[model samples]
Target: AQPKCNPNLHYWTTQDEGAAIGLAWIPYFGPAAEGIYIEGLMHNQDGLICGLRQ
Candidate 1:
């Protein structure tokens, strides 16, 4: 789980071994601030091609 946003905001993903993925995050704005609390997950691929939460 990648928490890129404010605190608990997490990004869930998976990938293959040695796979380098991109990631990013934004903040939460007002209800009408025209913004977004964004986040991303990069699977370092931890070790397997069919692993969990890679």
Candidate 2:
């Protein structure tokens, strides 16, 4: 397998989860009615470096 990044993507790896780990509580949308929406992604470690955005 190989890692590939295209126009629509930024990174890739051996598998989807990465060492049996994944993300959660991602906050997909926020305050849509207020014309303010924030989206994000992150791991489920609850540590210093977990959240990652695309």
Candidate 3:
């Protein structure tokens, strides 16, 4: 969660498939690199408020 600090995660209900598809650029890397790209994008959107923590 943190480096000797406190941490919290916030979840939102509204779904935005629009922006979701925006990050779909991950697919540009092809299937092999898809794993990392997906993780990177997901983590980016999930830093403070986890998009899909559920």
Candidate 4:
């Protein structure tokens, strides 16, 4: 299958399963309650960059 995003650049999202799971440790509302749940790109280990922001 084709790659998700361009190999050169990074991809971001606010609706990521893994991120949600990690954020589950929140108090009550969870990650959803946050302003922006930036989820970085989901790609293989090829020197790619990933990050998140609010």
Candidate 5:
């Protein structure tokens, strides 16, 4: 029940799995440009977190 964002443009999510809770998107230059775009590598927990909404 996650996939609701089509009021405008700019989107991403391919071969996506889980864990990055609340993977988000609220573009149109609103809400300070939304969040969620996490990357890989987290054996010790470092360099793993992303967000791109614009």
Candidate 6:
């Protein structure tokens, strides 16, 4: 029940606590570009172990 897992999504994420995932809007062309922001995420958490460090 959330937006797609990506920076260019239409809107923000639902902030799934268990999985530790999030996204937000950012300044356009500032650095990450508009709608391209990942508030937080984990390389490996609980059962999933394939991210940041991947």
Best by TM-score: 4
Better of 2 and 6 by lDDT: 6
Model 2 agreement with the true structure over 1-54: per-residue lDDT tens digits: 332322113221222222223323234323221112212321232223322321
Give the TM-score (vs. native) of candidate 1. Answer: 0.14
lDDT at position 37, candidate 5: 35
Candidate No. with top lDDT: 4
lDDT of each candidate versus the true structure: 0.27, 0.25, 0.34, 0.40, 0.29, 0.32
Candidate 2: misplaced stretches above 4 Å?
1-38, 49-54
The Cα RMSD of model 5 versus the native structure comes to 13.5
* Model 6 agreement with the true structure over 1-54: per-residue lDDT tens digits: 333344222333332322332223334322353442333442323323223222
Give candidate 6 misplaced runs (Cα > 4 Å).
1-26, 29-36, 42-54
Please give the lDDT score for candidate 3. Answer: 0.34
Clashing residue pairs in candidate 3 are none
- The 10-residue segment with the lowest total lDDT in model 2: 33-42
TM-score to true structure, per model = 0.14, 0.15, 0.19, 0.20, 0.15, 0.16
**What is candidate 3's lDDT per residue for 1-54, written digit by digit as tens?**
423211122211222322344554555543334433333333334444433342
Off by over 4 Å in 4: 1-21, 38-54
* TM-score of model 4 vs. true structure: 0.20
TM-score head-to-head 3 vs 6, winner: 3
